Amino acid sequence: EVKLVESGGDLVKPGGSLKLSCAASGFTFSGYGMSWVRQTPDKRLEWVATITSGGTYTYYPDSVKGRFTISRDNAKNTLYLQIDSLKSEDTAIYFCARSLAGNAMDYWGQGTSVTVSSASTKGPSVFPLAPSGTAALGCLVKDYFPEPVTVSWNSGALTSGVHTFPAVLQSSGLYSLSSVVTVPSSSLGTQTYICNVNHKPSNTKVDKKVEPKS
Amino acid sequence: QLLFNKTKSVEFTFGNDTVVIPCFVTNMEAQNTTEVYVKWKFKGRDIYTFDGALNKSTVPTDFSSAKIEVSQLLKGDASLKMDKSDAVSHTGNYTCEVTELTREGETIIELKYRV
Amino acid sequence: DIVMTQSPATLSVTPGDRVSLSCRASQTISDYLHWYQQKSHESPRLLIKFASQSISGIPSRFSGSGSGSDFTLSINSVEPEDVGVYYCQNGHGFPRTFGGGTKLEIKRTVAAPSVFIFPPSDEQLKSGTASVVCLLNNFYPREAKVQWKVDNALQSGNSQESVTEQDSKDSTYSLSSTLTLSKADYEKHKVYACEVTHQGLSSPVTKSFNRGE
Ligand SMILES: *[C@@H]1O[C@H](CO)[C@@H](O[C@@H]2O[C@H](CO)[C@@H](O[C@@H]3O[C@H](CO[C@H]4O[C@H](CO)[C@@H](O)[C@H](O)[C@@H]4O)[C@@H](O)[C@H](O[C@H]4O[C@H](CO)[C@@H](O)[C@H](O)[C@@H]4O)[C@@H]3O)[C@H](O)[C@H]2NC(C)=O)[C@H](O)[C@H]1NC(C)=O
Ligand SMILES: *[C@@H]1O[C@H](CO)[C@@H](O[C@@H]2O[C@H](CO)[C@@H](O[C@@H]3O[C@H](CO)[C@@H](O)[C@H](O)[C@@H]3O)[C@H](O)[C@H]2NC(C)=O)[C@H](O)[C@H]1NC(C)=O
Ligand SMILES: *[C@@H]1O[C@H](CO)[C@@H](O[C@@H]2O[C@H](CO)[C@@H](O)[C@H](O)[C@H]2NC(C)=O)[C@H](O)[C@H]1NC(C)=O
Ligand SMILES: *[C@@H]1O[C@H](CO)[C@@H](O)[C@H](O)[C@H]1NC(C)=O
Ligand SMILES: *[C@@H]1O[C@H](CO)[C@@H](O)[C@H](O)[C@H]1NC(C)=O
């Protein structure tokens, strides 16, 4: 199976530099053009770079021309995007894609997140949303920066009835997110419920057990 | 924009070995045919396509003999070859469209029957 | 500077409908136009290339048509799992540009929200801020009004809402509203109430608690 895995996204300050990477497998890497596409928080997609299968020719829109560099190592099946002189408008999810004629992109990676900001990273505080035939409980993941956080329940064993909501930007500049799960009311006090919060930009993981209030 | 060694028109007789309509891109930059798409048009209809990603050519029934030599494509040679019996009823303007990853171009050739 | 226009931005349709999505190009691009779908929390995937060529592994209900400047993606007998955003992309013209996307929503029967209220944790109250959370779970339509009352006094300007994308199975939405108070203001009142207005409720529904109960 064709598989593309981006890495290298991080929080970076304006004017800084960042090198994104994409590992490719499941196809003859050296036989295909490759591209990078970014998706801004408004959810619009923008093509930013394409490279031919031998690496010789590179193409960029005017918005990034002169400060993005795409490259590839066909012995290593790896695609790169170097971003220089970063601006706040470069904040986006960055996807690598296999490309065909007309830049039809028939396989995409999962994306890597880049945030351009002079603000410092901050890990979240995690508070219980304690349950009061169906009950609801959850975790409030408050005051972190930047996006994203990932939230799982019982280390991924609990998936049914879980809703993790879009984060909201507060007036302080930090993000706040809620994740809730609906469970049988008969499970409260007997079943253990733990929300696992991962905030890679601050290198913080938090697990919080959520119990009925005493 | 892809640029061409243009030709206004070519002529053929029934003494011609085969019918070749020239299409030569002078600034081709593709490095594998997966990056390339070739379309040949006649009187508004697509009469030959080569999809390089899929290694797949498509022709209508009145152009069943049309082909390009794929080994020559990355040299910029997208010339269409067809039998005389397919050509003799289809004289006129042909359009050659070549598309790469980010660049493309087209050129027009008139095929004429002379003796 | 080619411009790709997708209109409308949002399209609500009925399961079983034959749906058509529009894409318009600011210039002629013949049949060099591609279609992608991006489901929520996924990356885009190629549905159709060059206006009408189907991609291996794509459901056969997707097809495309059009040439020149106007293009259509067809979904014959749309399904609830087709909810998402659909993007066109030019294959000619520079740069390779994406349309703004059309978000496909599935219409279903009205489902009233299940409403839950959560008081702030004792732990958060220590640090000077109180967050009261109200959850509206698995409802349809998406339109829903949540009003906060504190000792039966309407609150304004101190709440934020967040809505999930439409679920691909039951075609419902979920919504959370968070009321943010200072700890000092929170300790001055007893009744915290979340009042929900929605089409599925014959009367606005209020969930409340008393601080310290
Ligand atoms: C333009 O790009 C195309 C592809 O887009 C190139 O054509 C490919 O060339 C590569 C490299 O020569 C071929 O890769 C080799 O594939 C062999 C198997 O492929 C066949 O069998 C599989 C089933 O497993 C089918 O799915 C497939 O359709 C084929 O029928 C392998 O046996 C080879 O393995 C060897 O090399 C690897 C390292 O890469 C070692 O790890 C192995 O041990 C072994 O030594 C190899 O993987 C590929 O098959 C070709 N694809 C097609 C579709 O033909 C063109 O060469 C390129 N044009 C240029 C560069 O001008
Ligand atoms: C389009 O199809 C052609 C075939 O019509 C593909 O070219 C062929 O690629 C295969 C596999 O790489 C070659 O077969 C193998 O070649 C090696 C190298 O000598 C040999 O050791 C193996 O035993 C086997 O013969 C084949 O030679 C080659 N043919 C030609 C004419 O180049 C081409 O890769 C395809 N392009 C695509 C799908 O983009
Ligand atoms: C039919 O045959 C004639 C004669 O071979 C071809 O004319 C030649 O075309 C080549 C390629 O363009 C030129 O290099 C020669 O100079 C041409 N010769 C003459 C005498 O003009 C013609 O191209 C063929 N027609 C088709 C449709 O293939
Ligand atoms: C275009 O014409 C020039 C001059 O005859 C020639 O040198 C060149 O090889 C041609 N290019 C192609 C792709 O045929
Ligand atoms: C071929 O095209 C040119 C313009 O591109 C035109 O002048 C000529 O008449 C055409 N030949 C026909 C229509 O037979």
Domains of chain C: 1-108 (2.60.40.10), 109-213 (2.60.40.10)
Question: Is residue A78 within 8 Å of residue A21, measured between CB atoms?
Answer: yes
Question: Is residue C44 within 8 Å of residue C58, measured between CB atoms?
Answer: no
Domain extent listing, chain B: 1-115
* Residues linked to residue A4 through DSSP beta bridges, in sequence order: A24
Query: Resolution of this entry in Å?
Result: 2.1
H-helix or E-strand spanning residue B82: strand B80-82
Torsion of CA C82, C86, C91, C95, to 10 degrees: -150
Q: Which two tokens stand for residue C167?
A: 């679920």
Question: Distance, CA B5 to ligand 4 centroid (Å)?
Answer: 6
Whose C-alpha lies nearest to ligand 1, atom 6? A31
Question: Distance, CA B31 to ligand 2 centroid (Å)?
Answer: 16
Q: Which two tokens stand for residue C102?
A: 């059309």
Question: Is residue C52 within 8 Å of residue C114, measured between CB atoms?
Answer: no
- Residue by residue, DSSP assigns A150-164 as EEEEGGGTB-TTEEE
Residues A36, A53: Cα–Cα separation, whole Å: 14
Q: Which amino acid is at A43?
A: K
Q: How far is CA C194 from CA A141, A161, A175, C197, C207, in A?
A: 21, 22, 23, 10, 5
On chain B, the residues whose CB falls within 8 A of the CB of A101 are 34-37, 51-53, 99-101
- Residue A123 gets which letter from DSSP? P
Q: How far is CA A47 from CA A93, B101, C47, C208, in A?
A: 12, 12, 18, 49
Whose C-alpha lies nearest to ligand 1, atom 12? A28
- Which of C186, C194, C178, C176 minimizes the C-alpha distance to C211? C186
Chain C within 8 Å of B102 (Cβ-Cβ)? Answer: yes
Q: Nearest residue on chain B to A55, judged by CA atoms? A: B31
- Residue C127's contacts (CB-CB under 8 Å, 6 or more residues apart) are A125, C183
Question: Is residue B36 within 8 Å of residue B99, measured between CB atoms?
Answer: yes
Question: Is residue A162 within 8 Å of residue A181, measured between CB atoms?
Answer: yes
Q: How far is CA C98 from the centre of its chain?
A: 20
**C62 torsion bin: left (phi>0), alpha (psi -120 to 50), beta (else):** beta
The helix/strand/coil state of A127 is strand
Q: By what method was this entry solved?
A: X-ray
Residues C174, C113: Cα–Cα separation, whole Å: 8
Residues A74, A91: Cα–Cα separation, whole Å: 28
- Closest Cβ–Cβ partner in A31, A59, A103 for B34: A31
Question: Is residue A67 within 8 Å of residue A133, measured between CB atoms?
Answer: no
- Closest Cβ–Cβ partner in A103, A142, A165 for C96: A103
Whose C-alpha lies nearest to ligand 4, atom 8? B26
- A165 to chain C, closest Cα gap in Å: 6
For residue B108, how many other CB atoms are within 10 A of its CB? Answer: 15
Q: Nearest residue on chain C to A96, judged by CA atoms? A: C43
The helix/strand/coil state of A185 is helix
Q: Do A99 and B52 touch (CB under 8 A)?
A: no
3-state secondary structure chain C: CCCEECCCCEEEECCCCEEEEEEEECCCCCCCEEEEEECCCCCCEEEEECCCEECCCCCCCEEEEEECCEEEEEEECCCHHHCEEEEEEECCCCCCEECCCEEEEECCCCECCEEEEECCCHHHHHCCEEEEEEEEEEEECCCCEEEEEECCCECCCCEEEEECCCCCCCCCEEEEEEEEEEHHHHCCCCEEEEEEECCCCCCCEEEEEECCC
Chain C interface mutation, best of A103, A110, A176, A188, highest count of C Cβ atoms under 10 Å = A103
Most distant pair of Cα atoms in chain B: their distance:
42
- C176 to chain B, closest Cα gap in Å: 44
Question: Distance, CA C22 to ligand 3 centroid (Å)?
Answer: 47
Burial degree of B111 (CB within 10 A; 0-12, 13-18, 19+): buried
On chain A, the residues whose CB falls within 8 A of the CB of B30 are 52
Cα angle, residue A94 at apex, residues A93 and A99 outer, rounded to 5°? 140
- Closest Cβ–Cβ partner in C36, C96, C133 for A178: C133
Q: Which two tokens stand for residue A208?
A: 């919080």
Q: Which amino acid is at B29?
A: E
- Residue C103's contacts (CB-CB under 8 Å, 6 or more residues apart) are C9, C10, C11, C84, C85
- Residue A64's contacts (CB-CB under 8 Å, 6 or more residues apart) are A48, A49
Q: Nearest residue on chain B to C91, judged by CA atoms? A: B102
Torsion of CA C21, C61, A44, A83, to 10 degrees: -140
C-beta of B64 in contact with ligand 4 (< 6 A): no
List the chains bordering chain C where 3 or more Cβ pairs fall under 8 Å: A, B
**CATH number for region B1-115:** 2.60.40.10
Residues A54, C23: Cα–Cα separation, whole Å: 33
- Residue C81's contacts (CB-CB under 8 Å, 6 or more residues apart) are C168, C169
**A41 torsion bin: left (phi>0), alpha (psi -120 to 50), beta (else):** alpha
Torsion of CA A10, A16, A17, A22, to 10 degrees: 20
- Residue B18 gets which letter from DSSP? S
* Residues linked to residue A213 through DSSP beta bridges, in sequence order: none
Question: Is residue A158 within 8 Å of residue A174, measured between CB atoms?
Answer: no
* Residues linked to residue C45 through DSSP beta bridges, in sequence order: C37
3-state secondary structure B34-74: HHCEEEEEECCEEEEEEECCCCEEECCHHHCCCECCHHHHH
Residues C124, C127: Cα–Cα separation, whole Å: 6
Question: Is residue C109 within 8 Å of residue C140, measured between CB atoms?
Answer: yes
C-beta of B10 in contact with ligand 3 (< 6 A): yes
Breakpoints of chain A, after residues (C–N > 2.5 Å): 132
For B45, half-sphere exposure in the C-beta direction (CA atoms, 13 angstrom radius) is 10
Q: Which two tokens stand for residue C189?
A: 């009142």
C-beta of B16 in contact with ligand 3 (< 6 A): yes
Q: How far is CA A1 from the centre of its chain?
A: 22
List the chains bordering chain A where 3 or more Cβ pairs fall under 8 Å: B, C
Residues A194, A139: Cα–Cα separation, whole Å: 9
- Residue A16 gets which letter from DSSP? -
Strands (E), chain A: 3-7, 11-12, 18-25, 33-39, 45-51, 58-59, 68-73, 78-83, 92-99, 105-108, 112-116, 125-129, 134-144, 150-153, 162-164, 168-169, 175-184, 194-199, 204-209
Question: Is residue C209 within 8 Å of residue C117, measured between CB atoms?
Answer: yes
Q: Probe ligand 3: pick from B5, B6, B9, B11, max atoms within 8 Å of CB? A: B11
Q: Which two tokens stand for residue B4?
A: 């061409």
Question: Is residue A197 within 8 Å of residue A149, measured between CB atoms?
Answer: yes
- Residue B24's contacts (CB-CB under 8 Å, 6 or more residues apart) are B4, B5, B76, B77, B78, B79
Q: Probe ligand 2: pick from B55, B69, B70, B71, max atoms within 8 Å of CB? A: B55
Beta pairing class for B104-113 and A194-199: unpaired
The helix/strand/coil state of A65 is coil
Residues B52, B66: Cα–Cα separation, whole Å: 16
Closest ligand 3 atom, residue B20 Cα: 28
Chain B within 8 Å of A2 (Cβ-Cβ)? Answer: no
- Which of A177, A169, A9 minimizes the C-alpha distance to A91? A9
Instruction: Catalogue all structural domains in chain A, each as residue range(s) with its CATH number.
Output: 1-118 (no CATH), 119-214 (2.60.40.10)
- C32 to chain B, closest Cα gap in Å: 9
